[PDB]
């Protein structure tokens, strides 16, 4: 599995045409705010293709 190519897995809204998002903010899936730490409803936004 290769670890060099990633893709954005979560986003609260869809991208506009030709928009480029490379932010690594922890996606908040719940109501509780993530403080940079992963956990329940707090996941890393990028995933590797492998």
């Amino acid at each position: 599995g290769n670890y060099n190519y990633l893709y954005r897995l979560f986003r609260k809204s869809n991208l506009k045409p030709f928009e480029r998002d490379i932010s690594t903010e922890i996606y908040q899936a719940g109501s509780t705010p993530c403080n940079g730490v992963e956990g329940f409803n707090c996941y890393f936004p990028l995933q590797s293709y492998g």
Binding site: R20, S23, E25
Partner: protein
């Protein structure tokens, strides 16, 4: 008035367009700049 900053958080966490016109040089950058609490340029 010598420049403009465009973005969402302006805190190096996202990309922010920076336009500065210094005398005769227009400079445009899209770097992840770390801006001050109150950005300004001194004379």
């Amino acid at each position: 008035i010598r420049g403009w900053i465009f973005g969402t958080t302006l805190d190096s966490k996202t990309q922010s367009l920076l336009i500065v016109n210094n005398a005769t040089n227009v400079v445009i950058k899209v770097c992840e700049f770390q801006f001050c609490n109150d950005p300004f340029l001194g004379v």
